[PDB]
UniProtKB/Swiss-Prot annotation:
<dbReference type="GO" id="GO:0001937">
    <property type="term" value="P:negative regulation of endothelial cell proliferation"/>
</dbReference>
<keyword id="KW-1000">Mitochondrion outer membrane</keyword>
<dbReference type="GO" id="GO:0005739">
    <property type="term" value="C:mitochondrion"/>
</dbReference>
<dbReference type="GO" id="GO:0016525">
    <property type="term" value="P:negative regulation of angiogenesis"/>
</dbReference>
<keyword id="KW-0812">Transmembrane</keyword>
<dbReference type="GO" id="GO:0070373">
    <property type="term" value="P:negative regulation of ERK1 and ERK2 cascade"/>
</dbReference>
<keyword id="KW-1133">Transmembrane helix</keyword>
<feature type="domain" description="PDZ">
    <location>
        <begin position="12"/>
        <end position="98"/>
    </location>
</feature>
<protein>
    <recommendedName>
        <fullName>Synaptojanin-2-binding protein</fullName>
    </recommendedName>
</protein>
<keyword id="KW-0472">Membrane</keyword>
<dbReference type="GO" id="GO:0008593">
    <property type="term" value="P:regulation of Notch signaling pathway"/>
</dbReference>
<keyword id="KW-0496">Mitochondrion</keyword>
<comment type="function">
    <text>Regulates endocytosis of activin type 2 receptor kinases through the Ral/RALBP1-dependent pathway and may be involved in suppression of activin-induced signal transduction.</text>
</comment>
<dbReference type="GO" id="GO:0005741">
    <property type="term" value="C:mitochondrial outer membrane"/>
</dbReference>
<dbReference type="GO" id="GO:0007266">
    <property type="term" value="P:Rho protein signal transduction"/>
</dbReference>
<dbReference type="GO" id="GO:1903671">
    <property type="term" value="P:negative regulation of sprouting angiogenesis"/>
</dbReference>
<dbReference type="GO" id="GO:0006605">
    <property type="term" value="P:protein targeting"/>
</dbReference>
């Protein structure tokens, strides 16, 4: 049973909220099909000195698959925003790091 990937492209990241939030910006959603050829919620910016920045693992361009196990597929942009806001202090993200079609 493989529990170690040759290439680590997907990752679970456990963040804790700071005073300014989780410390990243998102784009995407079912109402933002123009953003990507692979619809979902993406990290557009890691905020300088914020929670996500200090933690080190989240990257700009990450696709966030789920928050606390809740799939972000099928969500409007605003519905994703509300989810993050509703997630409490500790937040578990499952992400797919950037992968480019050539
Ligand atoms: Na940050």
């Amino acid at each position: 049973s493989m529990r170690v990937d040759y290439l680590v492209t997907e990752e679970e990241i456990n963040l804790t909220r700071g005073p300014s939030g989780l410390g990243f910006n998102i784009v995407g959603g079912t109402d933002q099909q123009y953003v990507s050829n692979d619809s979902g919620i993406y990290v557009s910016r890691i905020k300088e000195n914020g929670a996500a920045a200090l933690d080190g693992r989240l990257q700009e361009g990450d696709k966030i698959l789920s928050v606390n196990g809740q799939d972000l597929k099928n969500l409007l942009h605003q519905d994703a925003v509300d989810l993050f806001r509703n997630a409490g202090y500790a937040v578990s993200l499952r992400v797919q790091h950037r992968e480019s079609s050539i």
